Design a protein around this ligand. Structure first.
Ligand SMILES: [Zn+2]
Lengths: 71, 25, 134, 221, 82, 129, 102, 220
RNA sequence: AGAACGAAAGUCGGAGGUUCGAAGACGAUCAGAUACCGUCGUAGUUCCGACCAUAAACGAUGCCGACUGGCGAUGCGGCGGCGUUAUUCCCAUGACCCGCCGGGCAGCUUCCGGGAAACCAAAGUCUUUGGGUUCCGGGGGGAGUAUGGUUGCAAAGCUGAAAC
RNA sequence: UUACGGCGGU
């Protein structure tokens, strides 16, 4: 079981902070490799230049060509 | 593929790149 | 292929339950009785009912079949309600006990109100049949 | 039975001991240690007769407390207990079930085999348990004359007598028939009740009609 | 159920088991209420009245209603007095 | 390795009242658990109890009345201030009409209703309803 | 799912039992998973009894029995039909089948 | 046009039993849906919750049946929840109204404090589990309203309760079990001993012994 | 934190080498047989010494404490009793017989209660949630991979991500 | 004794 006594606030608060590193949406927001990885760099929009029209093919039950670019 | 034989073909493969790195230091 | 379906057996049971006083172990009379007293849509199930009627004639003349007919229900009263025996099976005035249950009837305070001879339990403790297969 | 009119009345001890009624076989349920006296050297548990007398009166007070006499249902599944249940119900005016107890009698209100009783009394707890667990659905108090083997789940006035021998079962239905009539103006407590306890016993095999005519060449001819 | 005005604001009052003091519910269909007709002293016959005892289905299913209804016959002068 | 004896005492009472029993046996006695039981006897949840005085730690036999729902314990003896007391009430009481968080004050083991009649916040010791 | 309460094996208070070997296929099984069968077959093949007792040098000869203990892996106990696949509620009985000798 | 077949429906048509609250306290098994329709007629609305198509696989295609969840109740302390499968929607949904009135329980109402008038909330906090879903109904102060998901609020408003804090854990997207869990919580508001229910009950006379006239004199 | 021991396989060294037997050789069977099957057979299997420290190392259930149904049986102690059998023609202890008490490996029944259910007398005493304390889980993969440290003669072990 | 496969979406 867990710790319950009026003296274990060091064990409880240290056991919570290292078990927070085990869900994604805390760890992608607090470990910093995930914001040094997304090409927006932590933003919502980005201007860029177009290199190539490229058409990817749709997934498993569908069949169409999704029109994409190579910004 | 069986998990103990997925283990073998990556234990065989991690000694293959433990040697490539050791080769080209 | 002889085995008789449920409508043959059920309708023949309601004849023998209800018109037992008119029937017998002759096939060719029961065929005429069941023609007159039932409503039978064709001739083939008529005498296929009547044959099962004669079968149960030899069957209920032997013993208590599922037979709520008035005679087979009345004669059992001569067993369960009669046979009040002229002597009793509880009244023999020489009945055995063991010396532990003479102690039981003494703290009921009936030790001197009864005759109640004792029998000693023979030495033993050889109950509890032996364990294990063989 | 805290009275003097309801005391043990020593003649029945001569009837109890001449029918079994105090011999419980070899193991006991944990809820019947209060009813038992001691174990023999045979292993047979013998039963305090003061305890089985006081419950039989207590069972009788429940049956007298039912207003309609044709409303208590008296039931039996095994054969040793089917003759007693027929003329217990004739005596105290109950309604019997002998033979197989069809499941769905107390709770399935559609078919015409629907009895709706207020109190039920049983020959045997573990051998006639289908009416017990079905009384559990329809909030119905149950008496069951029980032996030391028998488990005591839904029973209420479990009579700790016997349910194995044929002399014991018929006498206990006789003793319960006698006293439930004697708590009315039917038997005065004074004269002995002339209905014989041999009348409620389980019936002999087929030599019945043979033995009686072998000693009746002087009454018919 | 005795508000501050002092009134009964309650659909009914439920029974409770004379063995384990707990409430018989509205659809506990194993709960019995049964009568014990006591007898008058001198003649030993049925005098007209009785006593009622309610046994809830949870303590009736556990198998000690016979221990129960003897014990509340023990307190109420019917049993043996030994 | 009986770290709390009030926790063990109140667990045994709670198992037996849901079982249907009329008497329990509480095998170690202390003065903390006899002043716990003489808060719920006075409110009326248990009855006559005897302390069986022996020369090691005594036993207690309690007569269960049936009116007890749960008699749990808060096993870290948390401290409660009188500003903090009202939110301890609605966490572990079933209603506001009945049930008591019983807590040890400087002036004795009390109720929560008795404790705010005085002005003497303390350490929360257990609850019962 | 756990199929059986014991794990098909009669070990409770141990860590390890001896391996024994199957009789027909020689497979390594533990001593308490293995399906045992003790055979007390008479060596004379009972059709051939009244052809040797007349050829005997006695008038009443006690014919010796043969006492061979079999034990099987359960992959060969099921195929040889010495045990049978059972229903999920007729499984909780450890009583053996009847004998039916005459 | 209803002739009864049981004792309990027999004593209600001739108007010898009055105002259901005693056959609740003698814990009768109600058998016919006309008894509850007899007392609580013209005070019952019947609205359904969900019609879900359960189905089974067969040798030739699939048996497709329908599973109706209906809640019935007045606004003064009575609720039912009935569930019935049938092959077709309209006949499944019709027989569930019978099964919902046939299983009707009284809900107990209480106060948050300041017991000033008509009771408005649950007397204590209660719980109902059904499979994995536990519904916790918590007494709210006066003037709150029902703070819950829609489908337990459909049954609490149909229980004649004013205001109730509510929490819930589990697969609450399992409408049938999330309706029977909250129905179980309002099925045990009277199965809970509060200190206004301490004094030992006087036992009145049950209708099977108090009405033995109409069975013996009139039925026979 | 830091240690002790830890199946089998494996490594280093020495004894030994019957049987079995990875590898390999062949004979078959096969569309193909680098498999099943058969004949032979190296390392290995056995012992001593030194290492490695992992298993479906599983009751897939951490340890300590308490409370909460029943029944028969078993193993080891202890206590009490009819009797039976031992040199005993008397003994005391042995063997059985009937119980009780404690610790144990389990079983059978149960609407104790629990649980998503299989099932569990614990996996119960839990929204009526708090007996102590340790380890550990957070959708599936990538991945027990990468790299850093560290242990090892090696094989590898422990620690252990992210991009996607 | 031998019995190996069965396009994608519906
Ligand atoms: Zn084999």
């Amino acid at each position: 079981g867990k710790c319950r006594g009026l003296r274990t606030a060091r064990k409880l608060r240290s056991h919570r902070r290292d078990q927070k590193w085990h869900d994604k949406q805390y760890k992608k927001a607090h470990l910093g490799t995930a914001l040094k990885a997304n090409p927006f760099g932590g933003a919502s929009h980005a201007k860029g230049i177009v290199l190539e029209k490229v058409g990817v093919e749709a997934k498993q039950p569908n069949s169409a060509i999704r029109k994409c670019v190579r910004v | 593929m069986r998990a103990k034989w997925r283990k073998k073909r990556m234990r065989r493969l991690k000694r293959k790149r433990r040697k490539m790195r050791q080769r080209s230091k | 292929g002889r085995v008789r379906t449920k409508t043959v057996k059920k309708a023949a049971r309601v004849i023998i339950e209800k018109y037992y006083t008119r029937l017998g172990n002759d096939f060719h009379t029961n065929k005429r009785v069941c023609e007159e007293i039932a409503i039978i849509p064709s001739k083939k199930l008529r005498n296929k009912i009547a044959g099962y009627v004669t079968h149960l004639m030899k069957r209920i003349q032997r013993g208590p079949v599922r037979g709520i007919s008035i005679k087979l229900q009345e004669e059992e009263r001569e067993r369960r309600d009669n046979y009040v025996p002229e002597v009793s099976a509880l009244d023999q005035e020489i009945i055995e006990v063991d010396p532990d249950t003479k102690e039981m009837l003494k703290l009921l305070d009936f030790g001197s109100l009864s005759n109640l001879q004792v029998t000693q339990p023979t030495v033993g403790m050889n109950f509890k049949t032996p364990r294990g297969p063989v | 039975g805290a009275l003097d009119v309801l005391q043990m009345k020593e003649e029945d001890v001569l009837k109890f001991l001449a029918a079994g009624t105090h011999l419980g076989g070899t193991n006991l349920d944990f809820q019947m240690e209060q009813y038992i006296y001691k174990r023999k050297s045979d292993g047979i548990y013998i039963i305090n007769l003061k305890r089985t007398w006081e419950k039989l009166l207590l069972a009788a007070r429940a049956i007298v407390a039912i207003e309609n006499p044709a409303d208590v249902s008296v039931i039996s599944s095994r054969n040793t207990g089917q003759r007693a249940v027929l003329k217990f119900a004739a005596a105290t005016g109950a309604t019997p079930i002998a033979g197989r107890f069809t499941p769905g009698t107390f709770t399935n209100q559609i078919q015409a085999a629907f009895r709706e009783p207020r109190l039920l009394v049983v020959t045997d707890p573990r051998a006639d348990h289908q009416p017990l667990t079905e009384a559990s659905y329809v909030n119905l108090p149950t008496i069951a004359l029980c032996n030391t083997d028998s488990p005591l789940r839904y029973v209420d006035i479990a009579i700790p007598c016997n349910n194995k021998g044929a002399h014991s079962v018929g006498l206990m239905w006789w003793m319960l028939a006698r006293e439930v009539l004697r708590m009315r103006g039917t038997i005065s407590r004074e004269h002995p009740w002339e209905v014989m306890p041999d009348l409620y016993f389980y019936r002999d095999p087929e030599e019945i009609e043979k033995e009686e005519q072998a000693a009746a060449e002087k009454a018919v001819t | 159920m005795q508000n501050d005005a002092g009134e009964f604001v309650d659909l009914y009052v439920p029974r409770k088991c004379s063995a384990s003091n707990r409430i018989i519910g509205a659809k506990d269909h194993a709960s019995i209420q049964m009568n014990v007709a006591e007898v008058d002293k001198v003649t030993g016959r049925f005098n007209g009245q009785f006593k009622t005892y309610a046994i809830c289905g949870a303590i009736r299913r556990m198998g000690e209603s016979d221990d129960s209804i003897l014990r509340l016959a023990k307190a109420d002068g019917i049993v043996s007095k030994n | 390795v009986r770290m709390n004896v009030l926790a063990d005492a109140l667990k045994s009472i709670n198992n037996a009242e849901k079982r249907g029993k009329r008497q329990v046996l509480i095998r170690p006695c202390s003065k903390v658990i006899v002043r716990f039981l003489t808060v719920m006897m006075k409110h009326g949840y248990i009855g006559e109890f005897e302390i069986i005085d022996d020369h090691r730690a005594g036993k207690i036999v309690v007569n269960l009345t049936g009116r007890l729902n749960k008699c749990g314990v808060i096993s870290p003896r948390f401290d409660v201030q009188l500003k903090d007391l009202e939110k301890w009430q609605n966490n572990l009481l079933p209603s506001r009409q009945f049930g008591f968080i019983v807590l040890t004050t400087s002036a004795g083991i009390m109720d929560h209703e008795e404790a705010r009649r005085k002005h003497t916040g303390g350490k929360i010791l257990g609850f019962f309803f | 799912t756990k199929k059986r309460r014991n794990n098909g094996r009669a070990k409770k208070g141990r860590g390890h039992v001896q391996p024994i070997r199957c009789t027909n296929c020689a497979r390594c099984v533990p001593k308490d998973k293995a399906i045992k069968k003790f055979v007390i077959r008479n060596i004379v093949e009972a059709a051939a009894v009244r052809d040797i007792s007349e050829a005997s040098v006695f008038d009443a000869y006690v014919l010796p029995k043969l006492y061979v203990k079999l034990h099987y892996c359960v992959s060969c106990a099921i195929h040889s039909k010495v045990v049978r696949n059972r229903s999920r509620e007729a499984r909780k009985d450890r009583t053996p089948p009847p004998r039916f000798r005459p | 046009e209803w002739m009864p077949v049981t004792k309990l429906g027999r004593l209600v048509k001739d108007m010898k039993i009055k105002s259901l609250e005693e056959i609740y306290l003698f814990s009768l098994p109600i058998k016919e849906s006309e008894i509850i329709d007899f007392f609580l007629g013209a005070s019952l609305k019947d609205e359904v919750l969900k019609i879900m198509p359960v189905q089974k696989q067969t040798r030739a295609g699939q048996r497709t049946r329908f599973k109706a969840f209906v809640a019935i109740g007045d606004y003064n302390g009575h609720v039912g929840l009935g569930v019935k499968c049938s092959k077709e929607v309209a006949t499944a949904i019709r027989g569930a109204i019978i099964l919902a009135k046939l299983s009707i329980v009284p809900v107990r109402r209480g106060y948050w404090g300041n017991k000033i008038g008509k009771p408005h909330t649950v007397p204590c906090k209660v719980t109902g589990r059904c499979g994995s879903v536990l519904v916790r109904l918590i007494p709210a102060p006066r003037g709150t309203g029902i703070v819950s998901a829609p489908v337990p609020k459909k049954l609490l408003m149909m229980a004649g309760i004013d205001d109730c804090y509510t929490s819930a854990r589990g697969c609450t997207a399992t409408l049938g079990n999330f309706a029977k869990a909250t129905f179980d919580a309002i099925s045990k508001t009277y199965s809970y001993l509060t200190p206004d229910l301490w004094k030992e009950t006087v036992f009145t006379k049950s209708p099977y012994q108090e009405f033995t006239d109409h069975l013996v004199k009139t039925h026979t």
